[PDB]
Amino acid sequence: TYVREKVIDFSKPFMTLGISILYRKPNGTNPGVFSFLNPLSPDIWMYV
Amino acid sequence: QNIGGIFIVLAAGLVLSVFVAV
């Protein structure tokens, strides 16, 4: 960084880089019969 | 228990269903 240049000296920039993000894949899934209830109350699903 | 307000408006027919008996 420039501040770190302002205070001491490093070698030349030899292993160059640039900031980037890390995050889950995440493989987030919940398929199956246990999904379809959602648009309506599971109790109300029974009253029907 | 949100829209049960209509499982209960439902009753108006099951109440009305009595009359044609005579």
Swiss-Prot record, chain A:
Sites where a glycan is attached: 27
Residues annotated for L-glutamate binding in this entry: 4
Source organism, top-level taxon: Eukaryota
Tissue: Highest expression is found in the olfactory lobe, piriform cortex, dentate gyrus, hippocampus, granular cell layer of the cerebellum, and in caudate-putamen.
Post-translational modification comment from the UniProt entry: Sumoylation mediates kainate receptor-mediated endocytosis and regulates synaptic transmission. Sumoylation is enhanced by PIAS3 and desumoylated by SENP1.
Purpose of the protein: Ionotropic glutamate receptor that functions as a cation-permeable ligand-gated ion channel, gated by L-glutamate and the glutamatergic agonist kainic acid. L-glutamate acts as an excitatory neurotransmitter at many synapses in the central nervous system. Binding of the excitatory neurotransmitter L-glutamate induces a conformation change, leading to the opening of the cation channel, and thereby converts the chemical signal to an electrical impulse. The receptor then desensitizes rapidly and enters a transient inactive state, characterized by the presence of bound agonist.
Similarity comment: Belongs to the glutamate-gated ion channel (TC 1.A.10.1) family. GRIK2 subfamily.
The organism of origin for this protein: Rattus norvegicus
Oligomeric form and interacting partners: Homotetramer and heterotetramer with GRIK5. Tetramers may be formed by the dimerization of dimers. Assembles into a kainate-gated homomeric channel that does not bind AMPA. Can form functional heteromeric receptors with GRIK4 and GRIK5. Can form functional heteromeric receptors with GRIK3. Interacts with DLG4. Interacts with NETO2. Interacts (via C-terminus) with KLHL17 (via kelch repeats); the interaction targets GRIK2 for degradation via ubiquitin-proteasome pathway.
Subcellular compartments: Cell membrane; Postsynaptic cell membrane
Record-given protein name: Glutamate receptor ionotropic, kainate 2
Miscellaneous comment as given in the Swiss-Prot or TrEMBL entry: The postsynaptic actions of Glu are mediated by a variety of receptors that are named according to their selective agonists. This receptor binds domoate > kainate > quisqualate > glutamate. It does not bind AMPA without coexpression with GRIK5.
